[PDB]
Amino acid sequence: APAGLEVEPFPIQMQVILVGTPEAFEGLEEDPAFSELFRIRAEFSPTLP
Amino acid sequence: LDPAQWRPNLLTSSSSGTPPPIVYEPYATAPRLFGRLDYLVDRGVWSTN
Amino acid sequence: LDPAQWRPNLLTSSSSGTPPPIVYEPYATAPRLFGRLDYLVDRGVWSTN
């Protein structure tokens, strides 16, 4: 872009819910911010009674 | 006066909140996550609004 | 005469010192820390002031 637009950043009012396999979340849980941001762990039991 | 440059970009229609806005990105890329800004090319002249 | 090339570029604002000017960068890079010089493209011609 030549100068583009000076866009004001969009406010975030959502609740981000990331869904993945247990081995997928090692790659994202080395960051201290990850515990700070995503702090509820809804872990799915791979079996049911 | 350019009508396109002075029209309020209604990003998303007003939601009643029941059900709340539920959006899932199977393919999460920065243009798809944060949105993007498009442009026009007029004889090699690069512009946007 | 181009008056756009002779503005007093106030890179700061008058601070009373109470509270002291406090700036924190969540992430810091060279353009964010030291500032950057912008350029404008006129039909393909690079310019700056």
Q: In sequence order, what are the residues at sequence separation of 6 or more whose Cβ sits closer than 8 angstroms to the Cβ of residue A40?
A: none
Q: For residue A2, list chain C residues with Cβ-Cβ distance below 8 A.
A: 40-42
In three-state secondary structure terms, C24 is coil
**Rounded to an integer, what distance in angstroms lies between the CA atom of residue A47 and that of residue A32?**
30
Q: Is residue B19 reached through a cis peptide bond, with omega within 30 degrees of 0 on the bond before it? A: yes
Q: Which residues of B fall below an 8 Å CB-CB distance to A?
A: 11, 21, 34-35, 37, 39, 46-49
Beta strands in chain C (DSSP E): 40-42, 45-47
In this structure, what token pair is assigned to residue A49? 């009674």
Within an 8 Å CB–CB cutoff, is residue C44 touching chain B? yes
Chain A 2-31, residues with CB within 8 Å of chain C CB atoms: 2-3
- The resolution, in angstroms to one decimal, equals 3.0
Report the alpha-carbon angle C24-C39-C4, nearest 5: 95
CA–CA distance from A10 to each of A44, B13, B47, C34, C47 (Å)? 33, 16, 22, 25, 30
Beta bridge partners of C45: C42
| Helix, strand, coil percent content, chain A, rounded in steps of 5 | 25, 0, 75
